[PDB]
């Protein structure tokens, strides 16, 4: 009874339910992003850019070259270089 | 051993604790032995003889089958608990002419039969066809 | 041979030569449903020709459902003029047929053990991933979809003489094969 | 004395524990994405199957990289050549020599081998003492809960 | 703020002129209207979804849809509504759907 | 964003203005109202008339107003 | 049965807002009078650039511009066709047919295009 | 990748295991597991035998612990309805899973489908559908020199 046939994993196929459901992260027009970002900036000072994300839940690509064209990366020697919403 | 030290071996194994935050929980209880199998080509299991082992250089080792209870939490008050009966782990090289040997209790006939000398001792391993005593 | 292979199909892809904005076109649209989330595209679909079209962005089109030619380019100049009411500068370039799907029955039965086993340079076999054979046409471009019911689907086919060409030559091959 | 099982339980207990350490290793990636696991899949059964088995084949314990401190000559090919020889292979004893073995001289017969270890059999050359076989009703305790 | 569906209702409507026969004597600031509003509708969404466990059935003939913003707009010719306890007949009907 | 969040939308939107083509300065409050950022914080009007529109090296005061900073650059 | 659940509305909207009549500083005075007005208000081509080689091509563009038919308003939790038909899962939600109001918590339907 | 050269290499050695099975032991699904299988051959140039019926009768009937006499008759069965087209486009598994069926309840060793449908991968409701289509000739399919512990006639219907 052990590795029975399986067309695909339950887990496989639940996982995928859920992703099919969720659906891709759409682009939003960049005035709302912006000012989700600027909103955000208020919690913490520097964010990173995996959980900044989550947070804007926009494509990595968009969010890069929108972060980009204000926010820039300062290099920290204790853990990275990362992201700061700070345009200057 | 294998009536006592490889069911406590597993049993003094701790849970396993897994946090992503849903907690996953993974615990081994129960261990379970087939007679030595050898499968084929297409997959078929059938009994292995020792001689079989001998002559074809097969290794006399049985399937090791664990029970495994699987718990997951979703941190939503929900709790689900599954089990996975008879787990296979892996295969135990068998002493031969042990209780866990296919053997074990039959008459010198039917060791005959299986071109088994009845006064072979048995007490040793067979690994790849060479019969293998264990030194105290 | 007496059978000719019917249209099930057509693809085509226009150029409406202009940036467009989904958001605007499915709010004004009659028929477009359009999903980010999903789909990149905006999905329109009108019923006189019954063809489905997908809109992009760019103002490149995408037209499908067409059983023929024709209804591909009327459907898909239908589709440009929608959305050049809807104020867009939407114009008919490099208008392309991408794909076509053709359907037709041998009305006989089809051993594809046999065919595969002869023709296992160009047929795939698997009963376990689908029924049908698939055969992949070389001189023709054709990828042929071979049943034991004796229906076969060709399709990859960018003009219609590609369907016949490639039907005409499979049907000697599975008159061969005649169960 | 050290027999089959002992010696099998210390391998067991380590590649049990490879086992154990190899499924968090493959659930714990497959919870980092998020996906639930799937356990059969997570088991690698090969730790339990090679690992046992490649300790007789050799007499090696342990894992292989560690054959420095691992002991050697604990599994040996059966003696075939006569009934007794196979015997006498199936009841042999060892005495590692070792740090142990320099501090006190094992090779000579000691008093308390009365009934317990054969006094005549013994190998001739470098192992005359060390390696020992049992008296015929010698009898090796398999071990008990003290509880 | 709000996902805004029943204000273009006749409950809706009738919140709304009332809202707006306060502003013209006066009473009520703009900004106050609004939040009465999103209140409403929270108040009202919270309410069909908990008091309301009644089940029905329809059918009809499909003349037009559309899809933006996760809002369908299905416009329905010649739909039957049956009911365990009544039935209705409506020549066109618009559904407004949102999740 | 509040104290850091409206600074951003004025510079940004100031960079744009320039790009079409419009040298004339522009007041704070001008600015504030294509920026959407009327019902920003009094203590940060005085902050950006004091402080960001000066210390920053792309803004030119003019008359009183500001301007963009365009002969700095290289054009 | 309808009635009845207006009221129940009106009691959780006046409950809802006196948290907010209170802490914009509006006396509350101001929610007795808005029920009042509240009720009584409801009782060859080889060149083809040119695309007017086709007229009226398209039906009548008013239809959303009345919106004075009857008026379905509901959520979806699943929408999907098969090559004919529409299919529709919609869970609460609520109709004005005919003026007459009517709420619903699931419904199904199919329809044809 | 692996899993469809485990697949491929199974079936160039004689021994096939169904892609359900190559699954079972893989993270990868059966849909990718085909995906791969078919880019592989046209990569290596390279084709596979047509499985048969009988390429998957030992193992299932093994596991099913099934008699050696169980175990010829269903192949004799299987190889016999395929011979006599009784089951024209039912994939090979589907009817070695009803021939198992048809010879398991003939015997003394009786197997629900539901049994079956498990080693074998396939649901009961197509071993329903095939063994629907082979029952009909029972009596021909079946080895003549076959014990019947239970009466070819009285074999259930369904």
């Known amino acids: 009874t052990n590795y029975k046939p399986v067309a695909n994993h339950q887990y496989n196929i639940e996982y995928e339910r859920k992703k099919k459901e969720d659906g891709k992260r759409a682009r939003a027009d960049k005035q709302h992003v912006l000012d989700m970002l600027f909103s955000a900036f208020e919690k913490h000072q520097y964010y990173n850019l995996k959980d900044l994300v989550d947070i804007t839940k926009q494509p990595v690509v968009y969010l890069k070259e929108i972060l980009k064209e204000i926010g820039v990366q300062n290099v920290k020697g204790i853990h990275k270089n990362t992201w700061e919403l700070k345009p200057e | ?136 | 041979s007496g059978i000719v292979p019917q249209l099930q199909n057509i693809v085509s892809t226009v150029n409406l030569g202009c940036k467009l904005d989904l958001k605007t076109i499915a709010l004004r649209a009659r028929n477009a449903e359009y999903n980010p989330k999903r789909f990149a595209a905006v999905i329109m679909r009108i019923r006189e020709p019954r063809t489905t079209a997908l809109i992009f962005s760019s103002g490149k089109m995408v037209c499908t459902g067409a059983k023929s030619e024709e209804q591909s380019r009327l459907a898909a100049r239908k589709y440009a003029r929608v959305v050049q009411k809807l104020g867009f500068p939407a114009k008919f370039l490099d208008f392309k047929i991408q794909n076509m799907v053709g359907s037709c029955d041998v009305k006989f039965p089809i051993r594809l053990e046999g065919l595969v086993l002869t023709h296992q340079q160009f047929s795939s076999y698997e009963p376990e991933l689908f029924p049908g054979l698939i055969y992949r046409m070389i001189k023709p471009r054709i990828v042929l979809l071979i049943f034991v019911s004796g229906k076969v689907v060709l399709t990859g086919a960018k003009v219609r003489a590609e369907i016949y060409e490639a039907f005409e030559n499979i049907y000697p091959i599975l008159k061969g094969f005649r169960k | 004395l050290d027999l089959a099982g002992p010696l099998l339980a210390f391998l067991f207990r380590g590649m049990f524990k490879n086992l154990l350490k190899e499924v968090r290793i493959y659930a714990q990636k497959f919870i980092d994405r998020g996906k639930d696991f799937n356990l059969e899949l997570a088991i690698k059964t090969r730790i339990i199957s090679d690992g046992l088995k490649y300790s007789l084949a050799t007499g090696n314990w342990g894992d292989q990289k560690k054959a420095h401190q691992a002991r050697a000559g604990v599994s040996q090919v059966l003696n075939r050549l006569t009934f007794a020889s196979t015997l006498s292979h199936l009841r042999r004893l060892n005495s590692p020599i070792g740090r142990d073995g320099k501090l006190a001289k094992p090779r000579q017969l000691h008093n308390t081998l009365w009934g317990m270890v054969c006094p005549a059999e013994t190998p001739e050359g470098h192992a005359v003492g060390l390696v020992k076989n049992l008296a015929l009703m010698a009898y090796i305790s398999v071990g008990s809960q003290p509880s | 703020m709000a996902y805004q569906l029943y204000r273009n209702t006749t409950l809706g409507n009738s919140l709304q002129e009332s809202l707006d026969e306060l502003i013209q004597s006066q009473q009520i600031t703009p900004q106050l209207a609004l939040q009465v509003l999103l209140q409403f509708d929270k108040a009202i969404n919270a309410a069909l979804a908990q008091r309301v466990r009644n089940r029905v059935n329809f059918r009809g003939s499909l003349n037009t849809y559309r899809f933006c913003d996760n809002v369908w707009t299905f416009v329905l010719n010649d739909v039957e509504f049956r009911e365990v306890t009544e039935l209705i007949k409506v020549d066109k009907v618009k559904i407004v759907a949102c999740d | 964003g509040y104290k850091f969040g409206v600074l951003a939308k004025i510079v940004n939107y100031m960079k744009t203005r320039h790009q079409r083509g419009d040298t004339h300065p522009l007041t704070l409050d001008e600015i504030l109202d294509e920026t959407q950022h009327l019902d920003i914080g009094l203590k940060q009007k005085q902050w950006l008339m004091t402080e960001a529109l000066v210390n920053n090296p792309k803004i030119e005061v003019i008359d009183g107003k500001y301007a963009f900073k365009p002969k700095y650059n290289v054009r | 049965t309808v009635p009845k659940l207006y009221r129940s509305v009106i009691e959780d909207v006046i409950n809802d807002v006196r948290d907010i009549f209170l802490d914009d500083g509006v006396d509350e005075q101001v929610l007795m009078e808005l029920k009042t007005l509240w009720e009584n208000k409801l009782m060859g081509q080889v060149e083809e650039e040119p695309l007017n080689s086709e007229d009226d091509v398209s039906d009548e563009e008013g239809q959303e511009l009345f919106d004075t038919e009857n008026v379905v308003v509901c959520q979806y939790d699943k929408i999907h066709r098969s090559k004919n038909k529409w299919k529709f899962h919609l869970k609460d939600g609520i109709m004005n047919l005919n003026g007459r109001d009517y709420i619903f918590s699931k419904a199904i339907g199919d329809a044809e295009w | 990748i692996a899993s469809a050269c485990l697949y491929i290499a199974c079936r160039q050695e004689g021994v096939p295991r169904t892609f359900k099975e190559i699954c079972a032991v893989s993270r990868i699904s059966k849909k990718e597991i085909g995906r791969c299988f078919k880019l592989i051959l046209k990569a290596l140039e390279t084709s596979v035998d047509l499985i048969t019926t009988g390429d998957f009768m030992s193992r299932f009937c093994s596991n099913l612990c099934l008699p050696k006499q169980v175990q010829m008759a269903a192949t004799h069965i299987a190889r016999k309805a395929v011979e006599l087209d009784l089951v024209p486009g039912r994939s090979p598994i589907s009817v070695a899973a009803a021939a198992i069926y048809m010879a398991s309840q003939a015997s003394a060793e009786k197997r629900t489908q539901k049994e079956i449908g498990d080693i074998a991968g396939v649901a009961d409701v197509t071993i329903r559908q095939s063994y629907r289509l082979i029952y009909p000739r029972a009596p021909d399919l079946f080895p003549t020199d076959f014990k019947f512990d239970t009466p070819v006639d009285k074999l259930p219907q369904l």
């Not at chain 2, 084929?40 to 059938?46: L, T, V």
């Not at chain 2, 039969?113 to 007490?123: Q, R, T, V």
Request: charged share 25%.
């Open chain 2, 1 to 136: 051993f294998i009536q006592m030290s490889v069911q406590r071996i597993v049993e003094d194994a701790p849970p396993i604790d897994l946090q992503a935050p849903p907690r996953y929980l993974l615990k081994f209880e129960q261990i379970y032995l087939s007679k030595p199998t050898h499968w084929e080509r297409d997959g078929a299991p059938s009994p292995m003889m020792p001689n079989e082992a001998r002559l074809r250089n097969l290794t006399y080792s049985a399937p090791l089958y664990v029970d495994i209870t699987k718990t997951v939490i979703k941190e939503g008050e929900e709790q689900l608990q599954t089990q996975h009966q008879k787990t296979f782990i892996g295969k135990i090289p068998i002493m031969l002419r042990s209780t866990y040997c296919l053997l074990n209790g039959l008459t010198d006939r039917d060791l005959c039969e299986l071109n088994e000398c009845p006064l072979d001792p048995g007490g040793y391993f067979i690994i790849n066809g060479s019969e293998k005593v264990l030194i105290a």
